[PDB]
Amino acid sequence: KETAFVEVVLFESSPSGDYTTHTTGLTGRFSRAGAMLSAEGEIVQMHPLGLCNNNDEEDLYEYGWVGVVKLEQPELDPKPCLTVLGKAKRAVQRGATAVIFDVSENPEAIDQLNQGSEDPLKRPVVYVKGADAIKLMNIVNKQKVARARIQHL
Amino acid sequence: ETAFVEVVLFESSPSGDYTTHTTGLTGRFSRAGAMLSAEGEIVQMHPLGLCNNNDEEDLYEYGWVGVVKLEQPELDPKPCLTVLGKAKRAVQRGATAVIFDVSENPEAIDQLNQGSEDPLKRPVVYVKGADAIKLMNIVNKQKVARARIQHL
Amino acid sequence: CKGCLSCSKDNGCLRCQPKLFFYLRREGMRQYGECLQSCPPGYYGVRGPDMNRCSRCRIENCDSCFSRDFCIKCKSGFYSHKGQCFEECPEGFAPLDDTMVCV
Amino acid sequence: CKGCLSCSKDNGCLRCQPKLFFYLRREGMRQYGECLQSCPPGYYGVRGPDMNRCSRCRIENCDSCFSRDFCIKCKSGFYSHKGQCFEECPEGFAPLDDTMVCV
């Protein structure tokens, strides 16, 4: 399983039409659930209980977003609508160009995702933890919008 | 330094799922920009669409993959900027990559690669031939498309 | 992070107190759980085995509904008859004067 | 593809017949040149030896510019002075209200 170099970009237009940035790099890992591919797109956080088969017409997000899903301690939801792979699959069906799980509270998720390696999704499914995870989350909760660039070297 | 470019047409369904169509095409990474993979909404820029001489220009959402069909260099004998300049200008206005259609002006390839000393942070790709025809046709024919550019 | 049984900094509400309904709120980039007394406009309740849950009001030119197919406020140009909006009021009932409703 | 000295399927007009105004039209993904007699509404001309181009009228409160700093048409209600747009005409120019001007 390869290393996922992720950059999260904050951007602001100036008056002249040009852009200024700020860019936080993190590390993660590409799962075998998904392809080994770089991906870039606006980040969209997805609550874990908000990725399910069950809903007949879910809300619509522009094609080519990057999901971010903070997983919670596995016992806080014992009868989940879908497994962590199912959730990944939804995201991508709904147009995620990649999905990043934060697995800090749920390190078992990793092995589950990798047990999806026959039938892997066409798009990348990265996971992040620890300090790398804390960063991503801080940005998500605190800032308005952000762009992820995930590289596979 | 080969650029593997995919152009992706997409439609939502009633379910909220997407279906797509994807055209793969090939170009090269100019040494004028970083040798990095890139993905974004394609925005076409007219060659003159990229000139320094405006105090404020119209604003595109950060993260776009500009495309520029270059013309025979005599159609503008004295350009507002070089290609290098136009490329820089695009990235300053947030383009995440710049793809040049150099078919009608292949020495831009050289002019462009002259930037290898002060290179842009983002990729600058050039296409031509069939590859460029496919790119231009889609751009002409459709409302939107997502370019994925890869460095493998 | 309120009305909440389980609760996290990043996801808001994860479990509601039982007579409260779970709603996923988008605030820009973020999507977090809220535990609400009543569903908000455009939504309606469901009290359910997995959860008590706020579903999307799926109904004809109508901002708010109570139920699966009972509309409350239609969008104007509609005539609310027996909980389903319509084009005209049906033969039997009439468009009211200074009302957006049938009889 | 008219008004046009040079012209491409891909970029539309590339240079204009000398009296006419070069305009970038946005149309989905496309950006191509038009050569116009009048800059369209919301725009104004910037005639030059090299060429004439249209520019976006960016006067706060104004609809159509004659030029960068001079508004032709204020939006609904507003008051006109030095061809700027106003809520009410400031001190030292008595707003002849009927007319939506100052004096």
Author numbering:
A (entry chain A): 53 to 205
B (entry chain C): 54 to 205
C (entry chain B), D (entry chain D): 40 to 142
In the authors' words:
Rspo (R-spondin, also roof plate-specific spondin) proteins are evolutionarily conserved from fish to humans and have well-documented roles in a broad range of developmental and physiological processes resulting from enhancement of canonical and non-canonical Wnt signalling. ZNRF3/RNF43 specifically targets these Wnt receptors for ubiquitination and turnover, hence reducing Wnt signalling responses. Direct extracellular interaction with Rspo proteins inhibits ZNRF3/RNF43 activity. Here we report a molecular level analysis of the ZNRF3/RNF43 ectodomain structure and its interactions with Rspo proteins.
By using a combination of heavy atom and molecular-replacement-based phasing strategies, we determined multiple crystal structures for Xenopus (x) Rspo2Fu1–Fu2 (highest resolution 2.2 Å), xZNRF3ecto, zebrafish (z) ZNRF3ecto and mouse (m) ZNRF3ecto, (highest resolutions 2.4, 1.6 and 2.0 Å, respectively), plus complexes comprising xZNRF3ecto–xRspo2Fu1–Fu2, mZNRF3ecto–mRspo2Fu1–Fu2, mZNRF3ecto–xRspo2Fu1–Fu2 and xRNF4F3ecto–xRspo2Fu1–Fu2 (at 2.1, 2.8, 2.4 and 2.7 Å, respectively). The crystal structures of the ZNRF3ecto–Rspo2Fu1–Fu2 and RNF43ecto–Rspo2Fu1–Fu2 complexes revealed a 1:1 interaction between Fu1 of the Rspo2Fu1–Fu2 and a single ZNRF3ecto or RNF43ecto chain. The Met-finger at the tip of the second β-hairpin of Fu1 nestles into a pocket formed between the β3 strand and the αC–β7 loop of the ZNRF3ecto, which is lined with hydrophobic residues (I95, I191, V192, A198). The acidic region of the β3–β4 loop (immediately adjacent to C104 of the disulphide bridge) becomes more ordered in the ligand-bound ZNRF3ecto structures, probably as a result of electrostatic interactions with a positively charged patch on Rspo Fu1. For all ZNRF3ecto–Rspo2Fu1–Fu2 complex structures we determined (from five different combinations of species and crystal forms), the dimer found in most of the unliganded ZNRF3ecto crystal structures reoccurs. The overall assembly thus comprises a 2:2 complex of ZNRF3ecto–Rspo2Fu1–Fu2. The 2:2 complex resembles a crab with the ZNRF3ecto dimer forming the body from which the two Rspo2Fu1–Fu2 ligands diverge, without interacting with each other, as the pincers. Notably, the β1–β2 hairpin shows less conformational variation in the liganded ZNRF3ecto dimer structures, always maintaining a tight embrace, consistent with the Rspo2Fu1–Fu2 interactions contributing an indirect stabilizing effect on the dimer via the β3–β4 loop.
